Structure 1
Amino acid sequence: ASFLSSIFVPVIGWVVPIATFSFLFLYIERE
């Protein structure tokens, strides 16, 4: 099942940073 690396690697490099930094930036800037 080598295709999983093609799906799980970029999720760690792109999806996880975007989602985490997106929520955090709104959380730290909340009022």
Structure 2
Amino acid sequence: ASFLSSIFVPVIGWVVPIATFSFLFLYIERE
């Protein structure tokens, strides 16, 4: 099942930092 690399690596490469940075930027800039 070597096709899981095609679906975990782009999520951790792209989706994981986009979801993390967009959470943290809205959390540090929160009155």
- State the TM bucket, normalised to the shorter chain: over 0.9
Deviation at 1:8, TM superposition (A): 0.2
TM-score (norm 2): 0.95
Tell me, which stretches of 5 or more residues in structure 2 are unaligned? none
Q: Percent identity?
A: 100
TM-score (norm 1): 0.95
Could you report, residue by residue, the CA deviation over 1:1-31 in whole angstroms, capped at 9, with x for unpaired residues? 0110000000110000000000000000000
Mapped partners of 1:9, 1:18: distance in 2: 14
Tell me, which stretches of 5 or more residues in structure 1 are unaligned? none
Q: CA RMSD in A?
A: 0.3
How many residues are aligned here?
Answer: 31
